[PDB]
UniProtKB/TrEMBL annotation, chain F:
<keyword id="KW-0969">Cilium</keyword>
<comment type="subunit">
    <text>The basal body constitutes a major portion of the flagellar organelle and consists of a number of rings mounted on a central rod.</text>
</comment>
<dbReference type="InterPro" id="IPR006300">
    <property type="entry name" value="FlgB"/>
</dbReference>
<protein>
    <recommendedName>
        <fullName>Flagellar basal body rod protein FlgB</fullName>
    </recommendedName>
</protein>
<keyword id="KW-0966">Cell projection</keyword>
From TrEMBL, chain I:
<feature type="transmembrane region" description="Helical">
    <location>
        <begin position="50"/>
        <end position="69"/>
    </location>
</feature>
<keyword id="KW-1003">Cell membrane</keyword>
<keyword id="KW-0813">Transport</keyword>
<keyword id="KW-0966">Cell projection</keyword>
<comment type="function">
    <text>Plays a role in the flagellum-specific transport system.</text>
</comment>
UniProtKB/TrEMBL annotation, chain L:
<feature type="transmembrane region" description="Helical">
    <location>
        <begin position="51"/>
        <end position="70"/>
    </location>
</feature>
<keyword id="KW-0812">Transmembrane</keyword>
<dbReference type="GO" id="GO:0044780">
    <property type="term" value="P:bacterial-type flagellum assembly"/>
</dbReference>
<dbReference type="GO" id="GO:0005886">
    <property type="term" value="C:plasma membrane"/>
</dbReference>
<protein>
    <recommendedName>
        <fullName>Flagellar biosynthetic protein FliQ</fullName>
    </recommendedName>
</protein>
UniProtKB/TrEMBL annotation, chain M:
<dbReference type="GO" id="GO:0005886">
    <property type="term" value="C:plasma membrane"/>
</dbReference>
<comment type="function">
    <text>Role in flagellar biosynthesis.</text>
</comment>
<keyword id="KW-0975">Bacterial flagellum</keyword>
<keyword id="KW-1133">Transmembrane helix</keyword>
<keyword id="KW-1003">Cell membrane</keyword>
Amino acid sequence: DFNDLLTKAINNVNTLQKASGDLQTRFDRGDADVSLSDVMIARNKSSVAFDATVQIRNKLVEAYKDLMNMPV
Amino acid sequence: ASGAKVGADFNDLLTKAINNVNTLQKASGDLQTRFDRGDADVSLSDVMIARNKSSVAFDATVQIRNKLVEAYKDLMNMPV
Amino acid sequence: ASGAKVGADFNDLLTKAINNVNTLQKASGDLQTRFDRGDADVSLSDVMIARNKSSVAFDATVQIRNKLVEAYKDLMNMPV
Amino acid sequence: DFNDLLTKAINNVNTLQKASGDLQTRFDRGDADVSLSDVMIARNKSSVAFDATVQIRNKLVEAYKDLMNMPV
Amino acid sequence: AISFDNALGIHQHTVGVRERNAEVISTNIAQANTPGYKARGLDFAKELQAATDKLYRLPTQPDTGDGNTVDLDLERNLFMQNQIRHQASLDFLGSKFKNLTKAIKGE
Amino acid sequence: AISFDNALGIHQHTVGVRERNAEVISTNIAQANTPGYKARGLDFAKELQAATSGDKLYRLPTQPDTGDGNTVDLDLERNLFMQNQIRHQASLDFLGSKFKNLTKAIKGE
Amino acid sequence: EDYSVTLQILALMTMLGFLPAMVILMTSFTRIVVVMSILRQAMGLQQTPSNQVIIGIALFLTFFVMSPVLNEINDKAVQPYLNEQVTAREAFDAAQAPMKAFMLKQTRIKDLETFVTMSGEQVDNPEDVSMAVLIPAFITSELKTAFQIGFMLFLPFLIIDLVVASVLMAMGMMMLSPMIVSLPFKLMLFVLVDGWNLILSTLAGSFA
Amino acid sequence: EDYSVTLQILALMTMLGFLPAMVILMTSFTRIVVVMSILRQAMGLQQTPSNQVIIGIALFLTFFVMSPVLNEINDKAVQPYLNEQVTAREAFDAAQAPMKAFMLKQTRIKDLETFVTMSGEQVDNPEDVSMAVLIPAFITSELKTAFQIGFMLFLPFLIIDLVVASVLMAMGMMMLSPMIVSLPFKLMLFVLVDGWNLILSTLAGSFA
Amino acid sequence: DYSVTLQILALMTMLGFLPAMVILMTSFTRIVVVMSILRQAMGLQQTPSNQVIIGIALFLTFFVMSPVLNEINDKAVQPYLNEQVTAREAFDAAQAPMKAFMLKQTRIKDLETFVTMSGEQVDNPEDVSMAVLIPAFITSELKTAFQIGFMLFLPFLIIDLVVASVLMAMGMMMLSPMIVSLPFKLMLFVLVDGWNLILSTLAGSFA
Amino acid sequence: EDYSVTLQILALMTMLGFLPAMVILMTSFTRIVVVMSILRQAMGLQQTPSNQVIIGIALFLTFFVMSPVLNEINDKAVQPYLNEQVTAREAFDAAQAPMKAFMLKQTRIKDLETFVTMSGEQVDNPEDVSMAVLIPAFITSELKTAFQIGFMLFLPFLIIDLVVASVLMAMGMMMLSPMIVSLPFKLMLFVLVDGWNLILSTLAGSFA
Amino acid sequence: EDYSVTLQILALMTMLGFLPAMVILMTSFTRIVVVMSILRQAMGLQQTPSNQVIIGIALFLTFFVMSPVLNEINDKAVQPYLNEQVTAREAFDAAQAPMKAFMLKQTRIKDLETFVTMSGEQVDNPEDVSMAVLIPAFITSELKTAFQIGFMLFLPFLIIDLVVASVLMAMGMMMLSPMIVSLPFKLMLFVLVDGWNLILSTLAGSFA
Amino acid sequence: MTPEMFVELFREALWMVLIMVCAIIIPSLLIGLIVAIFQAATSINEQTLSFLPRLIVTLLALMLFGHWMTQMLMEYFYGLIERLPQVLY
Amino acid sequence: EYPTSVVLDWIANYFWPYVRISSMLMVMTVTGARFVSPRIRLYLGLAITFAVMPAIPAVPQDIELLSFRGFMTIAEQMIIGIAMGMVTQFMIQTFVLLGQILGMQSSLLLGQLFMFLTTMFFLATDGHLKMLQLVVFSFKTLPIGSGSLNAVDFREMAGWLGIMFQTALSMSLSGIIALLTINLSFGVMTRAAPQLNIFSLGFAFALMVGLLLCWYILAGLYSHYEMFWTVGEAQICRLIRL
């Protein structure tokens, strides 16, 4: 179930990024039924989610390097 | 003067500061949401004062955590 | 002459600077609250001068503190 | 092959750097057929590519150093 | 020590009083034409005591049958002074947190 | 060699003179309205020479005074103060880079 | 009163910082590394298995034996927390309980008695000690258990070393080094007995 | 569905960090490294080939023996990926299959059986086991296979040492160390047999 | 008193000196040295690992020095949070419980040596300044740790001498005794319940 | 379209990063170091010359013997590059060509044959082989050549050791260790033959 | 023209990094350690003096014998540089020359000829040869000189051991090892003649 | 404490290993003499003959004195541990 | 005042005395041991320098911290510290020499037994305190600014190898004669029958007596250590010119 937990979190981050890019493309194309607030809200959610993804990855990699470099 | 007694005492001291920070953040959030929803008897000064307090309180929480984590890493990574 | 005299002279230099910074901070605080309470003998120009000097004085205090800590952190990471 | 992959990747980097440099010189010398947006898109395009090839090189060297610094 | 009450001083309360004072002056100007309305003044020291009221203004000239004791020359000047002092209180109280954050973060 | 004088150069004395000049220029601006006050000038070359190893200059007015006797041309004072601040910023950058390069060499970072 | 979202993020981001400490103290990583470290010293090869490979196999082993506790944490604490069934503190307590059960299962009484007396708290049952006093008692128990396992594995190689050294002395060639003439036989014994499978199986078996 | 460009870079940059781990666990680097250490121990010189040279030869050889796998990775995964014929999901799975196939071919059933029962998963055929259960099994089999090859090379040098030790003892000199006398002949045996070409060719040929 | 902005800066700065305070004022020093000496006693070089050695010492230095933390809390932390005491007085109120603990855990001879070296005239041992007590404390604790640690070394040296002489008795002069003694060195430590015996005495050694 | 200045610097900084690898694999450093190692173990002295001095001597020797190829790189790849006469890509090829030629003069055709088949590339002429294949072939040839020279120098010291042991056994003093008495004669022979100047001259002349 | 303060600092730190090399390749450290290595090897003690004190005594001995050259560097180079009498470039050359002169006083003509031909350069005076070529010739002469002294030091201990062995054999006890009896006699004769003081005179004064 | 007390500790430890080594070796020394005198009486000159008999009794002695040597090492460790107060006082 | 003078002097007045103190610790017998971490040793050197600061005279202000003359000052402070440290290593290793000569003569790790006991002698006799008193006295009679080890100091310190053998032989001469005479007596007494010989039988006999003689050596070793320490302490005072 831990494999499911990791993929579900990544899928949530990937889903937020797709929504952010989708609204930016629609807004930049000139679609009338798009508000700048929704675009800014969407891209801020994507930025926070991706920042979490990077920091969690850095923590796990730092944890991995500490264990592997331990003198047995 | 027992290990469990002092461990509880510093835990009580530590959890009191955490609760104090949590109180400031909840109060700041409560003032923001009442003013934002349209309540007439909420002044912008009270909203701005509370959210400035929470930012300072949370900034201290992060900085104190960094000092403790660095101190822990310093003692664990020392070349014994 | 001994090395303690140099150490004491350095200690008095730091204590004098801290007192000078503390004196400015308290002086600015009184002038701020004197003008804020509504005293008519206090000029806004003097208040802004007072808090300008205290802010600069404290900023100098922060810079010296960071250099002292960085030197100590540099010192502890040395072969011995 | 993997060798040709490494070779193509670098030739992509200098092509972006060569194109970015040419646009910078044309705009700087006062040519009226070069727009600032073209320069900025191109120069940011090469900056990401050169940062990527620096990071990839750094990771490969770290891997080499780790492998060679193990007792055999 | 080291508490928000002492770190902020009385600048946390002055901003509120300057808002209340501005409200009362706005009421006086609006109610200048309505007969029978008595101009209301706010005592600064009272809200100072409340931190650590809503009085009446005696006219300098007689009424003209309305009974309204609002002098629009006075109200405009008192509203201008309150607005200027309100901005200074924001500057004072705003810099309290800016110095406080710089002490904690060290940068 | 390997000394702070030979390393910092004249960028340590120049900063002090530029701050001295700003004190003189600000004095003229503040004393612009005082009648009888004469504008004060500062010689950079002489001050730098004195600082490196170690009198009153007055500024000739462009136009006669209106009776008060003050020879402070506030149009010129602002222009000189603006120039002094720019050259002082360069001197701090020049002097600041001297310490950074010295630290870089003594640590190889 | 549940903590704010900002504090909860800051709270579990700190757990990642202490993650290496949990592995080396509260998990099975300590015993597995020690046993394989002593096993390496038992054979003639000094550093042939290498530290990184030893840690790599240990990480896979400690992941497989801690799966029931990890699954229990997810199915008791993580899922209710994600589904808004319990608060942050209840989720934290629900996650700690299976971890405490694992350490208490593989510990020694005398080690628990030693630490409860020094701390100075009343104890009447094993399942009342704070985690602050269980961690040092658990690692001490693991080190003793690891040493006992390492001793058993060392003995068969010691027998070979004594035999081959005595046989050379029987012919009278004292200058010939027993260590060089014993390494092929030590390695071969580890092969036909298939040590790399049963020893890891015993380490997995010893925790359950 | 398909991972965003930012996430694809993050995953790729992550694998570069684990590149040293994949070399010593998922490739032929470990077996070749172990064999040379045993071969060096068999001869009298303990640090003459030098660690840096041995790892350097191991890196060159592991590049030659993993070339069929790498080319399959390039053809199956990278080329459809760079031409936008498969998504990022399919490309990563298509890259994993040839690497998994290589590790499955060099593993042992018992080692796979040991970790499958340890992982607690229901596996019907070996050719579909999870990656997390194959890596510990593959490195386990490589270490065992390395010991068998090392024992083969140790015997000829051991025989020379035994022969010269007994000849010296026959003539009555029980104080002369056979190791000094045996060393020139140990080196010569590795020379006229062309050892540095024979050993490396067998190690490369041991994965076919 | 110092301004609010300055006294926040003071506690923040010394918050980063917490590792410094632990190493040279509390019982962290003696336990680590004894742990390190005992680690070298057995044939294993880094099997206990540095992190585990430190982790045990950190738990021990909290249980043993728990009375010190209790007095500091109730005499310095509590009065300061109730505004019953100022910043400097609270800091001085914390030094006294820790200075008393360090003074009683040192050797007279070392303090006599250090007061002579410091060049200050003090008539009685209990009035020495903390500037000279800190080096005197660690110097004495180092001697105590070395004396305690090497006595633990002796039983493991006994095994080495016995096995080495036995191997030399049969003419097996080439067999290294260290690899033969290693299994028996571990057994001696586990039979006597070493990991509990040393810690119990180390905890009871302080006062 | 030569590489841009930023990429040219990035390439050169990478080559300095692999400088120990270039010296220990692509140069004469390995053969000199191994021959010195065999000679040191040939005599009774274990590590009297010390490791730093041995490497220090080898570094100067490997710089002198490779001065011709170093100059050829300078005269054909560096000076034209600095004088703005050759494309940076061409200059890199002009520097690599003399290095490849030198490595081919000191390699064995058997080493090339096994590595070319190992790489699985269809190349016939023994001059257009890749550096990926040439370097392992070169270092393998250097190790084998060093063993041959090491055996050559070992024989006279073996002769002295056997004579001293035989003479001592002739007098019936079997208890006396031959090694303690043999060593001064080993120093004696090596010094009146002017060994240090002789061996370094032969090692310098060997690379041809 | 003269190097800037920033660049002079960089050069100073660089020479400090190479300081261990200058001790063991340019000063008298190599000869002293090799000679002291023979003395430890000659007596029955294997590691009894231990490596630490030998290096420490060697370092102090070098500072004693390098004191004339170090003072000559101090006077000629450091003093004008500190007083800002001369530039950094000429001060560095003024410091290099005394080291070159000292290395010439401890080298042989044959050694210089071999390396100057090896470097493939043109020179007519030994006084202006590059220090890059003088260093390998210096240590090569040092190693040969140290072996000569060590051989002379080894003879008296060989003399004592052979006498004791002959006496024991002549008395008929063909069963007792000469080493145990001879060791006190070698140590007693090393003390009552004050052997180390004699070795100091013939080692420190050997340079001149 | 005092250096003399440390000398007493080290002499006591060396005394114990003398008892340990004597119990193991003496059974082998007696057998070595018995075989050697038997060879001398019978004019037998096989020098390597009396190795296995010494090895057999040495291994037998280790098995026979297994309990005693254990009890003695453990009690010595306890004796030192209970003597730690001497150091602290 | 210009603040440069105040701050620079304290760093010069602290680090330079500390360097000599720290350099002695890293070469010292106890503080330079492998058991103690560098961090604990670093704090010990920092604490000792701060405490003994009043007894340290003010360093000359002529030499600048950033100058080649100041760089030489740092190096010559270490040389003084290493000189004291090597003397302590000389004594302990001489006892290690005493242990191994007895072990070698005992037909046989015995150096470690003497090394540990000699370390106890160093700690019990407050040898570490005396060394710390010596280094602070070195500041008085051998000032930081003008002063360094001369050539004669190097030669005296290089001559300590003869001190090792003479002292080690003097301690073991009585025991080594006992070891030889019993082995020679055993050889001659059993030489009547060449069938017995000794070989491994002689190995067992020699080692039992050798361990017994080491028991005698430890009985009277303390007096030899006291005389040895006096010789070593006199050498240290000669280095610091006290």
